[PDB]
């Protein structure tokens, strides 16, 4: 097995600046080269490291021949620097953003938000990580050697053509069910191996698929200790056998490396349309962990962090967000999937470019749907009632609290700081507060993070 690639950990320079270059290059997957896109390289991106309380300016060079934008997913920053569809960086052009980091330690990420093209641009290879540190987290004595016992794990599926090129399409099928493929990548490599010191291994898991939800576990069933969610540390570890992760979500887990025997991180079959076609109809390796006897001192604390109380609910503004799909989209998509894949496509279970909607509207860039309060908790009620698709619903500008998730109180490891909530044929409720402003010219997005739904209308803008 190839060794797991580790995103460079990119800090500020003497002038408090970080340079990102967006560009095309070449990658090799199982023998055949593909044109890929990357930040500061051919594929994927670095891990931009930020400290709570410190400004940094990011200089962003668009070295594509097409428009793109750069969105910091998870960051509580003004709309100006949020990099939603209105933050065009022109091909050949340079844009600079000041990020004033004021939130708990967390693993966030970044990726394009090009209007109507976000799915293709991620599929082409564009994604990096954001490691936010603060004063609280460095006191915990967690595994902290980057790329040794503190390892980013970005999991994505891709589909490839006969010539080896990435085979991306926004069509009637993928607009309905998402883009998914048959090859799993972990930091860009097919089934890599990571060499991990005895003791505690820390993994920062990102589900960076366009459309495929995942479910982590190990091959010998050893536990994961969940220490952190999208928006950072939990109050204390949650110990699990398996860990479902939606598109765009991050969890940090600790795994015990307690003797010399190799095991795999795997992902278990999910009940989501399309996502259990072979080879994903059985447990599927993500990466091989190979124990090694070098220095490590990282520990698992009893107690991680102190989070705020849920605010009381009386008097909060409530906003209804109904997600919906043209029924014509569902049918033709369900059909195209059966024609192409046969009966396996359903295991576990006409212009489409505006067929997906929130509150009966496809995303309009020039009409924000509302102004949200600044600095005041609101309750957003997001409903997927009336359709059968999975919608990981994500809200920019914020880390929120899930009050109920698709019909139940959140699981314990999902009850902390989140920027994504599951919506799937039921209704979810989040408590949300915006500490920063967003004008109509640079509004915040709230959207399904199944990328093809987003691209085909399941997005709204809002101001603060």
CA distance 414 to 351: 37
3-state secondary structure 169-217: CCCHHHHHHCCCCCEEEECCEECCEEEEECEEEEEEEEECCCCCCEEEE
Among positions 3, 11, 19, 290, the unique one binding Na ion when judged by CB under 5 A? 19
Nearer to Cu ion, 73 or 120 (CB): 73
Work out what residue 256 binds among Cu ion, Na ion, none; the CB cut-off runs from 5 to 8 Å by kind: Na ion
In order of 80, 89, 111, 282, 299, the CA distances from 209 in angstroms are 27, 24, 12, 18, 30
Q: Which residue has the tokens 């390289």?
A: 41
194 is in an annotated binding site: no
| Smaller CB separation from Na ion, 228 or 448 | 228
Of 75, 108, 97, whose CA–CA distance to 396 is shortest? 75
Q: Which is nearer to Cu ion, 189 or 458 (by Cβ)?
A: 458
Strand order in the sheet with 214-218: 193-197, 284-292, 263-267, 214-218, 243-245
Please give the backbone phi and psi of residue 177, each rounded to the nearest 5 degrees, phi first: -110, -10
What is the residue-wise DSSP string for 92-111? Answer: T-EEEEEEE--S-SEEEEEE
Q: Is 442 annotated as a binding residue?
A: no
CB of 178 to Cu ion, least distance (A): 8
Q: Which is nearer to Na ion, 184 or 255 (CB)?
A: 255
Cβ-based nearer residue to Cu ion, 194 or 357: 357
Q: Does residue 436 have a known ligand-binding role?
A: no
Residue appearing with tokens 């093809």: 452
Site string for Na ion, 74-113 (x = CB under 5 A): ----------------------------------------
Residue 436 binding target from Cu ion, Na ion, none, CB below 5 to 8 Å by type: none
Q: Please check if 396 is assigned to a binding site.
A: yes
Q: Is 448 annotated as a binding residue?
A: yes
Instruction: Decide which of Cu ion, Na ion, none touches 453; Cβ closer than 5 to 8 Å per partner kind.
Output: Cu ion
In contact, 38 and 125? CB cutoff 8 Å: yes
User: Which residue ranges make up the site for Cu ion (CB under 5 A)?
Assistant: 73, 391, 396, 448, 450, 453
Q: Which does 133 bind (CB under 5 to 8 A by kind): Cu ion, Na ion, none?
A: none
Return the residue of 67, 80, 102, 256 that touches Na ion, per CB under 5 A: 256
**Residue closer to Cu ion, measured from CB, 250 or 391:** 391
Element (H, E) at 321: strand 317-325
3-state SS class at 250: strand
From the list Cu ion, Na ion, none, partner contacted by residue 59 (C-beta under 5 to 8 A by kind):
Na ion
Q: Which residues of 254-269 are buried (b: 16+ CB within 10 A; e: fewer)?
A: bbebeeeeebbbbbbe
DSSP code at position 166: B
CB of 373 to Cu ion, least distance (A): 19
Residue number with the shortest CB distance to Cu ion? 448
Q: What, of Cu ion, Na ion, none, does residue 448 touch, CB below 5 to 8 Å by kind?
A: Cu ion
Q: Tell which positions 42-81 bind Na ion, by CB under 5 A.
A: 59
What's the CA gap between 458 and 50, in Å, rounded? Answer: 31
Contact partner at residue 450 from Cu ion, Na ion, none, CB < 5 to 8 Å by partner kind: Cu ion
Q: What are the φ and ψ backbone dihedral angles of 417, each rounded to 5 degrees?
A: -85, 115
Name which of 59 and 182 has its Cβ closer to Na ion.
59
Please state whether beta strands 55-62 and 263-267 pair in parallel, antiparallel, or not at all (unpaired).
Answer: unpaired
| CA 316 – CA 309 distance, rounded (Å) | 15
171 binds Na ion (CB under 5 A): no
447 is in an annotated binding site: yes
Binding mask 205-244 for Na ion (x = CB under 5 A): ------------------x---------------------
Look at residue 228 and give the partner it binds from Cu ion, Na ion, none, a contact being a CB closer than 5 to 8 Å depending on partner kind: none
Binding residues for Cu cation: 71, 73, 111, 113, 391, 394, 396, 447-449, 453
Q: Which residues bind Na ion (CB under 5 A)?
A: 19, 59, 223, 256
């Amino acid at each position: 097995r190839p060794t797991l690639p580790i995103p460079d950990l990119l800090t500020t320079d003497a002038r408090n600046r970080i340079q990102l270059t967006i560009g095309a290059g070449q990658s090799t997957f199982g023998g055949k080269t593909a044109t890929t896109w990357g930040y500061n390289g051919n594929l994927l991106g670095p891990a931009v490291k930020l400290q709570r309380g410190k400004a940094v300016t990011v200089d962003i060079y668009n070295q594509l021949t097409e428009e793109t934008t750069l969105h910091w997913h998870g960051l509580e920053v003004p709309g100006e620097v949020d990099g939603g569809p209105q933050g065009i960086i022109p091909p050949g052009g340079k844009r600079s953003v000041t990020l004033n980091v004021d939130q708990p330690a967390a693993t966030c990420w970044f990726h394009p938000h090009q209007h109507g093209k976000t799915g293709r641009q991620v599929a082409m290879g564009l994604a990096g990580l954001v490691v936010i540190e603060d004063d609280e987290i460095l006191k915990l004595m967690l595994p902290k050697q980057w790329g040794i016992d503190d390892v980013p794990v970005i999991v994505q599926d891709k589909k490839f053509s006969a010539d080896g090129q990435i085979d991306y399409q926004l069509d009637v099928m993928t607009a309905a069910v998402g883009w998914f493929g048959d090859t799993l990548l972990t930091n860009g490599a097919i089934y890599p191996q990571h060499a991990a010191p005895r003791g505690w291994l820390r993994l920062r898991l990102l589900n960076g698929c366009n459309a495929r939800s995942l479910n982590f576990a190990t091959s010998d069933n050893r536990p994961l200790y969940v220490i952190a969610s999208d928006g950072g540390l939990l109050p204390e570890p949650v110990k699990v056998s398996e860990l479902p992760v939606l598109m765009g979500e991050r969890f940090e887990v600790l795994v015990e490396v307690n003797d010399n025997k190799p095991f795999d991180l795997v992902t278990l079959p999910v009940s989501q349309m399309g996502m259990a076609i072979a080879p994903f109809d059985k447990p599927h390796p993500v990466m091989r962990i190979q124990p090694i006897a070098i220095s490590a001192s990282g520990a698992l604390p009893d107690t991680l962090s102190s989070l705020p109380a849920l605010p009381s609910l009386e008097g909060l503004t409530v906003r209804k967000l109904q997600l919906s799909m043209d029924p014509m989209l569902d049918m033709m998509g369900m059909q195209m999937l059966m024609e192409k894949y046969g009966d396996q496509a359903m295991a576990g279970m006409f212009d489409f470019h505006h067929a997906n909607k929130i509150n009966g509207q496809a995303f309009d860039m020039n009409k924000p749907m509302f102004a949200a309060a600044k600095g005041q908790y609101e309750r957003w009620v997001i409903s997927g009632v009336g359709d059968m698709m999975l919608h990981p619903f994500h809200i920019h500008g914020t880390q929120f609290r899930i009050l109920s998730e698709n019909g139940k109180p959140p699981a314990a490891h999902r009850a902390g700081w989140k920027d994504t909530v599951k919506v799937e044929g039921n209704v979810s409720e989040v408590l949300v507060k915006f500490n920063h402003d967003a004008p109509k010219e640079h509004a915040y997005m709230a959207h399904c993070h199944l990328l093809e739904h987003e691209d085909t209308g399941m997005m709204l803008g809002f101001t603060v």
